[PDB]
Amino acid sequence: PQITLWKRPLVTIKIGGQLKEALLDTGADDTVLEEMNLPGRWKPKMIGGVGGFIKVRQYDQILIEICGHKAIGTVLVGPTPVNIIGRNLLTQIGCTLNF
Amino acid sequence: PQITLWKRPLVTIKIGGQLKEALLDTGADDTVLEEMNLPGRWKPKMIGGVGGFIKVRQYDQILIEICGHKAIGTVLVGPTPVNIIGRNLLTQIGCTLNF
Numbered sequence: 659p660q661i662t663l664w665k666r667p668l669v670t671i672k673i674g675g676q677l678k679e680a681l682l683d684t685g686a687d688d689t690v691l692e693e694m695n696l697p698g699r700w701k702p703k704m705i706g707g708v709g710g711f712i713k714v715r716q717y718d719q720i721l722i723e724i725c726g727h728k729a730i731g732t733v734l735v736g737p738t739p740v741n742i743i744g745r746n747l748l749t750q751i752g753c754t755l756n757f
Numbered sequence: 758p759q760i761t762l763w764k765r766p767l768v769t770i771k772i773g774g775q776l777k778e779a780l781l782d783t784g785a786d787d788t789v790l791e792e793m794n795l796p797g798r799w800k801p802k803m804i805g806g807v808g809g810f811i812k813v814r815q816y817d818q819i820l821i822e823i824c825g826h827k828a829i830g831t832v833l834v835g836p837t838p839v840n841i842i843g844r845n846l847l848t849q850i851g852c853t854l855n856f
């Protein structure tokens with residue numbers, strides 16, 4: 659679809675069998691979701707931005723459905739202020755900015 | 758133009774005669790630029806990032822030119838590591854997310 663930006667570009671995602679809302683965040687290198695239990699081994703990592711860093715659990719090669727489009731990639735889980743879909747998955751679903 | 762997300766969506770912007778590199782960021786409610794000494798009055802504000810909040814100065818009705826389109830509105834200024842064009846100005850230039 660084509661999404662305007664008068665409101666936050668929030669979409670429904672499906673990960674680990676759960677439905678959630680996530681923000682399409684072109685300013686995010688990576689995808690960071692709120693605390694949740696996902697199958698498989700995870701590695702401790704830290705990611706930073708405005709304000710500093712937070713500790714996250716890195717899950718690799720995770721299936722995630724974003725607004726009906728499938729992606730398989732790295733998902734970071736931790737105390738993020740909002741669920742954000744970053745460029746690592748936006749690229750997989752063919753997302754671009756246009757004006 | 759069409760901006761793919763393989764790399765950070767950085768573009769040249771023009772503000773008050775100066776050229777800067779800035780992120781086209783659908784995850785940012787409001788435009789925020791790196792520290793700069795603007796004239797005029799402002800309102801204190803706090804913005805929430807991945808690592809917590811920082812304090813910024815809010816300026817109103819600031820003109821920024823983005824790839825031939827002129828946008829005017831709220832421009833925050835603070836100790837950010839990158840210049841960010843947020844939704845408040847992206848909407849004015851007709852910017853959409855497409856996949």
Ligand SMILES: CCC(CC)CN(C[C@@H](O)[C@H](Cc1ccccc1)NC(=O)O[C@H]1CO[C@H]2OCC[C@H]21)S(=O)(=O)c1ccc(N)cc1
Pocket residue numbers: 681683684685686687688689690705706707708739740742744782784785786787788789804805806807833838839841843
């Ligand atoms: C809605 C919550 C997000 C944080 C999640 C808000 N951010 C915009 C976001 O695009 C930010 C913009 C940003 C880009 C680069 C450095 C600092 C901030 N990117 C970001 O934090 O991404 C992190 C996750 O992937 C990694 O790649 C970038 C940092 C990591 S922000 O920078 O803190 C921001 C908050 C409020 C306004 N008005 C303008 C910007």
